[PDB]
Design a protein around this ligand. Structure first.
Ligand SMILES: N[C@@H](CCC(=O)O)C(=O)O
Length: 484
């Protein structure tokens, strides 16, 4: 049974990168009929707080990225890391390093000057009780380093990358596995230690990771061996790239799942999208798929082996498709607080029939749910200001005649049929001596303040239910007349 896991640190909100990894995990586990484990790497850090854990779970659930196990919290497991490290010290596979950061910096500078590989020189591997005690009496307290063999050939068959090969000397020397603490105490366990201890304990069969952390892989492989475990398979995916081709920056633009959600993007659209960022679907599947369908066909072979540029136009293309999948009643419900938030005056209960009609109208051409604000303005703001084209349209010689006909022949009854509407345009045109196009264009100007926009008959139907076509036609007629 395949076992995979998401291991986010709640140091910030759920970002697209992490969620993308979660998608690949959920997709791979589901494909292989395995388990998806969620592990929260909650650290003593200033950054780690319960509001980011909250945001992580919320976003995963919302994206439909259901875990089968957890969340298992790192902070409950502290002693397991302590045990693992103590086992390493006892075995002499780890040791106390008393080398200060100022000492490391001088080493590193002396390395650059000499054209030597940048690394810790393993200077404290074999310290004498006397040497340790000298450091301690000067008030030093040691970190704990895990021994890495310089000449060790580390290799793995990566599920995305292929054979990946590292020398032991390429890992930067004996790595710190625990932060400073006095001898007899063990400090805060570092990432590479924690992840192997937990991956071994959680029985993880396959680790899915961003390629930006590929260098931890040979380090972790050595920890598994030292702890007597066989490492799992690794799959290193390329990161999501910019709109142009550099790193997607957390400090530049929108990356968090909660922000995309806030913007009017739907969960299934986000899911479908993140998948498309790196995974190209097989012939016959297409670009519009659920997670359940993506699971039937998911494989690491088909992962685009370089960065997927993030494209707003494609996210929008998908979101439009999901918005259209929304039931008219659910869809309207999504819109109401949006319109409410804009300060638009209406009553959910009283104004329902045309509100619904407005939803029906606006649905087919929204890229985000937020687009219903500006696209609804003409139906919620009473007065219309005429644009440069509307003003020139009403300035046409027969505009007054058209409008006055329309105004005089509007039905009192609340529902305007498409039949009654076409009758009116046809008859207003006949009165003015003009073609239907110019008539509609004059009606458009009157009702919207523009010469182009949403389906006119439907816009008029909506505005008629409000009783708003009547004062608008009157305002346009008065406008036509001021030119005359
Ligand atoms: N947070 C990193 C490393 C955690 C891990 O999967 O071990 C990533 O997923 O790219």
């Amino acid at each position: 049974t395949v076992r995979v896991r998401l291991a986010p640190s709640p140091t910030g909100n759920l970002h697209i990168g992490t969620a993308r990894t979660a998608v690949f995990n959920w997709l791979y586990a589901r494909h292989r009929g395995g388990k998806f484990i969620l592990r929260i790497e909650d650290t003593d850090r200033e950054r780690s707080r319960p509001e980011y854990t909250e945001n992580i779970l919320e976003g995963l659930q919302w994206l439909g990225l259901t875990w089968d196990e957890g969340p298992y919290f790192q902070s409950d497991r502290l002693d397991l890391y302590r045990q693992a490290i103590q086992t390493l010290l006892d075995k002499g596979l780890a040791y106390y390093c008393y080398c200060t950061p100022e000492e490391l910096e001088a080493l590193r500078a002396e390395q650059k000057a000499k054209g030597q590989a940048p690394r810790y020189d393993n200077r404290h591997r074999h310290l004498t009780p006397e040497e340790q005690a000298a450091f301690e009496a000067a008030g030093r307290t040691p970190v704990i380093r895990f021994k890495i063999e310089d000449d060790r050939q580390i290799e793995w068959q990566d599920l995305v990358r292929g054979r990946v090969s590292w020398q032991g000397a390429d890992l930067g020397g004996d790595m710190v596995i625990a932060r400073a603490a006095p001898r007899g105490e063990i400090g805060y366990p570092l990432y590479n230690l924690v992840v192997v201890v937990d991956d071994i304990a959680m029985g993880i069969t396959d680790v899915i990771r961003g390629e930006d952390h590929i260098g931890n892989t040979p380090k972790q492989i050595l920890l598994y061996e030292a702890l007597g475990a066989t490492p799992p398979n690794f799959a290193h995916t390329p990161l999501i790239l910019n709109s142009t081709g550099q790193k997607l920056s957390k400090r530049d633009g929108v990356t968090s799942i909660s922000d995309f959600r806030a913007m009017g993007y739907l969960a299934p659209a986000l899911a479908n999208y993140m998948t498309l960022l790196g995974w190209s679907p097989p012939e016959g599947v297409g670009e519009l798929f659920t997670l359940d369908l993506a699971a039937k066909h998911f494989s690491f072979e088909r992962i685009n082996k370089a960065g997927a540029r993030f494209d707003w136009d494609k996210l929008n293309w998908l979101n439009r498709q999901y918005i259209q999948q929304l039931e008219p009643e659910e869809f309207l419900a999504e819109l109401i607080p949006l319109w409410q938030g804009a300060g638009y005056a209406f009553d959910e209960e009283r104004d329902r029939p045309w509100l619904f009609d407005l939803a029906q109208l606006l649905q087919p051409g929204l890229n985000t749910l937020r687009e219903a604000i500006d696209q609804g303005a003409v139906f919620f703001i009473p007065s219309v200001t005429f644009d440069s084209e509307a003003m020139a349209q009403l300035g046409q010689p027969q505009s007054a005649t058209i409008l006055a006909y329309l105004l005089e022949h509007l039905p009192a009854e609340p529902a305007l049929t498409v039949a009654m509407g076409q009758q009116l345009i046809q008859q207003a045109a006949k009165a003015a001596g003009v073609k239907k196009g110019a008539t509609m264009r004059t009606l458009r100007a009157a009702l919207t303040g523009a010469v182009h926009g949403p389906d006119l008959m439907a816009a008029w139907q909506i505005l008629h239910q409000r009783g708003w076509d009547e004062p608008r036609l009157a305002a346009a007629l008065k406008q036509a007349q001021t030119t005359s």
